[PDB]
From Swiss-Prot, chains A, B:
Gene, per the UniProt record: talB
Pathway: Carbohydrate degradation; pentose phosphate pathway; D-glyceraldehyde 3-phosphate and beta-D-fructose 6-phosphate from D-ribose 5-phosphate and D-xylulose 5-phosphate (non-oxidative stage): step 2/3
A Pfam family assignment: TAL_FSA
InterPro entries: Aldolase_TIM (IPR013785), TAL/FSA (IPR001585), Transaldolase_1 (IPR004730), Transaldolase_AS (IPR018225)
Transmembrane segments: none
Native source organism of the sequence: Escherichia coli (strain K12)
Regulation: Inhibited by Tris-HCl and phosphate buffer. Also competitively inhibited by sugars with L configuration at C2, such as D-arabinose-5-phosphate and L-glyceraldehyde.
Subcellular location, record wording: Cytoplasm
Signal peptide (UniProt feature, chain positions): none
EC number: 2.2.1.2
Gene Ontology cellular-component terms listed: cytosol; membrane
Name the record gives this protein: Transaldolase B
The UniProt record lists the keyword Cytoplasm: yes
GO biological process, any: carbohydrate metabolic process
Length: 316, 316
């Protein structure tokens, strides 16, 4: 059989895209989106209908141009999620405005607003994951949201300190990155070529997976961001993996079964005391790669958010 | 006359070193030290006496080896400050353990401990500046310390958000860096050569100086970290400048008077509302250079602190 089919025996397959065409081809269980993917999807000609509905709905909610742009942008993200939910049995991940990444209260409010829009469309909370950046503020927001019945997807996770803080907050799922970690090493280190087993991104997710299973944490581990199929195959066994359409195609066209790589067969160990903000900040900033990438990831998503607002602005 | 003598007309000269030999040669008003300079100074043969006194004093305060290492390391920093105060009319800056940079309460406690050691030696608070890293936590610690009569020197300042937060906290003095900013651009940008007027570090301090004077802030602006005399001359007029012995020598050996570059001749403007933690974090992380350098600066000072403890450990 093919690699994709084989991988499904050990790992739940998730598609990283806002394009419904991929949902029909690979039949993933869940789908994930982010500000950049939403911006790109808005370019798809067939999605024109989704944009017009968002704008029309917005103008029916208020007569304030400022509020219309925000309502239109949020509704568009939700409308795209709605189309995807028609083709997948699982969940859709929708990300909150990245400009609120360092504001706990504002993030909680925005998350509840998005949940409200999904509910108004008839979708219940068990089919959604609100996506937030893994800053200390985002983690504190998620801990509160989970208590109120809203499940979260903690993304842009680079350091071990982030992974630990997320597990202790009891979040539903984490999206530790692989590929962006590789990018950092290729650009700031001597070694430009890495064997799958020594890929820094692969090692990071593997260590996080071990820590989570070893201590009985229920948080779902979903590896994200890939540069080649080698990284994916090296993580076979991870709870879930969200993969871009291009790599999904490569897996489906290659023959040969694969072997499970990630597993924890021991018994659960006792959990340590919770990490404090001071300890979190110290440990996270000890990692040069994580310091650069977390901040950069937030900057980029914020820029794409602004570009989307521009686009919608010229339509009001 | 020479450049050094000329610069003194517009700017208060400060020496960046723990070596007393420089105090006698350039007669600066104040002197600044940091963990790295303290580590190097400990290597100076004539300072052997200072190390032995620190260790002896420590063993007389407690019988706990762990506490002796901390008491010895802190006392050594103070003993070096004491020698310098004999040769300068102004203040000495002593830095708190960089490992506490993200802990407000621990930083306040350590600062008071250092002040205690200076007081026990008969030195009053008006001859000292406690040096802390400009993280949000360090700034909050400084605001509290100033209210209790302890003046602070906020260092490792790279972003405008840091400069603004420091002014609003009413700290006694800030040490915005110049040279380390240049290093970042030379390593992460195409342009490897900069004319003095276009040096990123020079532009940063100039903008901060303008903002402070324009709004009537009393915080002293002291530029720090230099790579060449061109940067120094371009900042003539800054309240104070702390310079390494090597560049101090170059200024004293070059002939020709210089012209004042930094000035604010307008009237004071009204101050805006105070920046909040969320706004601070967003703005600081918008600056790639500042994100990298603040974290890096803290890591290095922490490593030098550990090396000093090792050295002292083998003497107990």
């Amino acid at each position: 059989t093919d690699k994709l089919t084989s991988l499904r025996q050990y790992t739940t397959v998730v598609a990283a895209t806002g394009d419904i065409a991929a949902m029909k081809l690979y039949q993933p269980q869940d789908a994930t989106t982010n500000p950049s993917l939403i911006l790109n999807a808005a370019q798809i000609p067939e999605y024109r209908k989704l944009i017009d509905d968002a704008v029309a709905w917005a103008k029916q909610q208020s007569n304030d141009r400022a509020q219309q742009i925000v309502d239109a942008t949020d509704k568009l993200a939700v409308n795209i999620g709605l189309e995807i939910l028609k083709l997948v049995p699982g969940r859709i991940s929708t990300e909150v405005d990245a400009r609120l990444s360092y504001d706990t209260e504002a993030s909680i409010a925005k998350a509840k607003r998005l949940i409200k829009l999904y509910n108004d469309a008839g979708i219940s909370n068990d089919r959604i994951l609100i996506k937030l950046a893994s800053t200390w503020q985002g983690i504190r927001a998620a801990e509160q949201l989970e208590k109120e019945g809203i499940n979260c997807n903690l993304t842009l996770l680079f350091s071990f300190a982030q992974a630990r803080a997320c597990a202790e907050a009891g979040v539903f799922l984490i999206s530790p990155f692989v590929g962006r970690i590789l990018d950092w090493y290729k650009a700031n280190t001597d070694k430009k070529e890495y064997a799958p087993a020594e890929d820094p991104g692969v090692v990071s997710v593997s260590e996080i997976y071990q820590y989570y299973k070893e201590h009985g944490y229920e948080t779902v581990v979903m590896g994200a961001s890939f540069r080649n199929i080698g990284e994916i195959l090296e993580l076979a066994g991870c709870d879930r993996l969200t993969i871009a359409p291009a790599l999904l195609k490569e897996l489906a066209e290659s023959e040969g079964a694969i072997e499970r790589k990630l597993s924890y067969t021991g018994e659960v160990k006792a959990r340590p005391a919770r990490i404090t903000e001071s300890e979190f900040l110290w440990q996270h900033n000890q990692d040069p790669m994580a310091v650069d990438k977390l901040a950069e990831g937030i900057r980029k998503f914020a820029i794409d958010q602004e570009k989307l607002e521009k686009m919608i602005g010229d339509l009001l």
